[model samples]
Target: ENCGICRMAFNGCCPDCKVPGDDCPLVWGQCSHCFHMHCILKWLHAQQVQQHCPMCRQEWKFKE
Candidate 1:
């Protein structure tokens, strides 16, 4: 539906930049919560302990 951080449609660019594919690509946490990569990284860096998804509140991790 939408990005948890920006609250904008996932198909569009993030608020920080104009370019869509590179600057604001969609990124998914292990919980499957999705947000613009730039937006999620901004949030993640502020956390100390287990980072949770902004949408689902589950632990966040990149899929490997």
Candidate 2:
């Protein structure tokens, strides 16, 4: 899979900071937008309002 924000492949490494295995795990939002945990965290922190998926623009909720 690929992170929507960084446009990088998801596996053992993530963009902006690649290290080891399980570093960039996939986090799927209830809105159906999936991204690396790192990318989503950064994005959520930067949001001043209700957190939304970058791709779908819906409220961010973890996919269960």
Candidate 3:
């Protein structure tokens, strides 16, 4: 599928952040970028939707 933000290209992803035993399913995002579910959630909350991904600022829904 095309990246939601960059429209790059995501073949697949593997989340490995804070995962104790490796269970979280990989997620898709703009560009070929991917992140652990919990990790990205923390990042989004931490940023408080203040800014968009570095590549582009189409919108910052995750931060919000």
- Residue-by-residue lDDT tens digits, candidate 2, 1-64: 7778888876645665664345457888899988888888889888858778989978998899
**Top TM-score model:** 1
Number of the top lDDT candidate = 1
Tens digits of per-residue lDDT for model 3, 1-53: 63333333334333342345555444646765665454556667787857666
Tell me how candidate 3 scores on lDDT. Answer: 0.50
lDDT of each: 0.82, 0.78, 0.50
lDDT for 40 (candidate 2):
89
lDDT digits (tens) for residues 2-60 of candidate 1: 89888988988788776444556889889989998888888987775887887887898
Q: For each candidate, what TM-score against the reference?
A: 0.61, 0.58, 0.37
In model 3, the runs with Cα more than 4 Å from the true position are: 1-22, 49-64
Q: In model 3, how large is the Cα lDDT of residue 55?
A: 83
Which prediction has more favorable lDDT, 1 or 2?
1
Q: How many residue pairs clash per model?
A: 0, 0, 3
* Cα error, candidate 3, residue 14 (Å): 9.9
